[PDB]
């Protein structure tokens, strides 16, 4: 069980850790989050009581180092940092626990939610989508734009998601114009799976990472990417059986986990009605379809 201490909390902020979150008052003696389960990625995120704009946060994995949060009064936000001094860090963490100024990562033992949302997400791939190689964690916020969004400005701050575009030379073999545009199997399996992602796990991982950035930060290009990757699969006549079954599980927990009140901007009506009811894979998402109908029958 790992720990992310906080130097202090100078400003009123809603802190999140994964799908959990707490209200912290200005200069409340809050000094971190303990009992963070090893073995998964995590995200710690922030929304100031004064600016319900700009949710922001840090992806990390505690196996990769000792991390802590510190408010920066110049830049006006909670920053993640790495403590290189192993001893000096265990010292802070033990004294804060002794003083009991740390909340406990509140995992119900029955609950596989976080594992299910992050099964295929790996820190190494996150750091390729969010390029900032001097840090071992990754910053994301509400407003960051994707590489594809930028093509249609500042590249330091881009979400370097894999560009998917159904009406592109990459997607459409010459001579198979009609075939490949109605049956994206070629584009999925050869271009994307075998070519770029190498295996289905890295694809699922990006898909999931995209979804979580949309859910946690309302990052709109992330939502676009998540939908694109679902659509590519569901619009392919030929998908490995193991991908379809996992995809139904992936999407079930994403839909289960979404805030009920956000279903209007996070869920693209066209994509979901196409995937669940028109696509080649209309019949391969039984859990995803059951939960969609019982929870958002309006959108459909």
């Amino acid at each position: 069980m790992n720990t992310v201490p906080f130097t202090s909390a100078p400003i009123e902020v809603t802190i999140g850790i994964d799908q959990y979150s707490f209200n912290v008052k200005e200069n409340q003696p809050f000094h971190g989050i303990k009992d963070i389960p090893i073995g998964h990625v995590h995200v710690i995120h922030f929304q100031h009581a004064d600016n319900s704009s700009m949710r922001y946060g840090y992806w990390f994995d505690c196996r990769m180092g000792n991390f802590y949060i510190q408010y920066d009064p110049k830049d006006g936000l909670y920053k993640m940092m790495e403590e290189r001094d192993g001893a000096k860090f265990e010292n802070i963490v033990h004294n804060f626990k002794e003083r009991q100024m740390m909340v406990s990562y509140p995992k119900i033992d029955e609950d596989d939610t976080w594992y299910n949302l992050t099964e295929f997400v790996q820190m190494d791939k996150i750091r390729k989508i969010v390029r900032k190689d001097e840090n071992q964690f990754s910053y994301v916020d509400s407003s960051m734009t994707t590489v594809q969004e930028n093509e249609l400005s500042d590249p330091a701050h881009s979400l370097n998601y894999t560009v998917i575009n159904f009406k592109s030379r990459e997607a459409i073999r010459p001579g198979h114009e009609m075939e490949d545009f109605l049956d994206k199997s070629y584009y999925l399996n050869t271009v994307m799976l075998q070519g770029i992602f190498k295996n289905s796990s890295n694809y699922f991982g990006e898909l999931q990472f995209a979804f979580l950035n949309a859910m946690f930060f309302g990052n709109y290009g992330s939502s676009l990417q998540w939908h694109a990757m679902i659509e590519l699969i569901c619009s392919s006549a030929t998908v490995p059986k193991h991908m379809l079954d996992k995809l139904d599980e992936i999407l079930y927990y994403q839909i289960k986990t979404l805030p009920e009140q956000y279903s209007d901007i996070l869920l693209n009506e066209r994509v979901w009605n196409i995937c669940l009811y028109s696509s080649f894979q209309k019949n391969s998402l039984h859990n995803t379809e059951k939960i969609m109908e019982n929870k958002y029958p309006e959108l459909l």
């Binding site: 009406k167 592109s168 030379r169 459409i172 010459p174 114009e177 009609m178 545009f181």
Partner: protein
């Protein structure tokens, strides 16, 4: 963007553009089988590709053999239209390739777009106009070449005959669409109007009669009256 009544004069500037109408690409008769079921029989069709500035018509004849052994033919017809238009562009010298292609039906946008991926700087556009280009097979010489074809064939026409020698593109296109509108709403009367007078003939190299300027005025007025009459009949106004 889409083409509509506001930006209508853009058709007559000096940017090469083509209308593509696919309404007659896939043509069937519907009949009863011996067992009483319904079957279709295909007949020859045509893509109607028209430069509205110059009158040059690119009539690509679609032979029924194209459909042999194929399913979802109405969907396929859209892709074959896109394939044939793309091949037309590729066949044209660079300085002749269009800057825009306007599809008369929005279902052609995706197929054409996909087929034109090699031409990113050719803009594919829809239109909100309700162009009467489906009446092109009411023009006897066009219907005849399509129906007689024994293989895929491209046949080139000037749909304006020699009109541009005396009138502008804008006026030329308004006459063409008024003729075809009339032909669409009541072919029998429209054709009557055009031929009632045996002394006004059609040149072998033309599509329409060799009316004088004053005779075109009586014609266009006759076609106008036809369209408005049929409207009252349609809606009881």
């Amino acid at each position: 963007g889409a083409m509509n009544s506001s930006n209508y004069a853009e058709l007559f500037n000096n940017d090469i553009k083509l209308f593509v109408d696919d309404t007659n690409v896939y043509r069937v008769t519907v009949h009863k089988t011996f067992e009483g079921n319904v079957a279709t029989k295909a007949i020859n069709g045509c893509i109607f590709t028209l430069n509205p500035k110059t009158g040059h018509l690119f009539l690509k004849i679609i032979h029924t053999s194209v459909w042999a052994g194929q399913k979802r033919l109405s969907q396929l017809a859209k892709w074959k239209t896109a394939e044939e238009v793309s091949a037309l562009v590729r066949s044209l010298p660079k300085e002749e390739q269009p800057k825009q292609i306007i599809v008369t039906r929005k279902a052609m946008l995706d197929p054409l777009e996909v087929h034109m991926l090699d031409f990113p700087n050719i803009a594919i556009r829809p239109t909100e106009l309700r162009l009467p280009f489906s009446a092109a097979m009411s023009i006897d010489k066009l219907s005849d070449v399509v129906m007689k074809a024994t293989e895929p064939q491209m046949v080139l026409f000037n749909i304006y005959d020699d009109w541009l020698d005396r009138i502008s593109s804008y006026t030329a296109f308004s006459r063409l669409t008024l003729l075809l509108r009339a032909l669409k709403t009541n072919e029998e009367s429209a054709k009557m109007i055009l031929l009632s007078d045996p002394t006004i003939t059609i040149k072998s190299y033309h599509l329409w009669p060799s009316f004088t300027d004053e005779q075109w005025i009586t014609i266009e007025s006759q076609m106008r009256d036809l369209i408005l009459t049929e409207y009252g009949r349609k809606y009881n106004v």
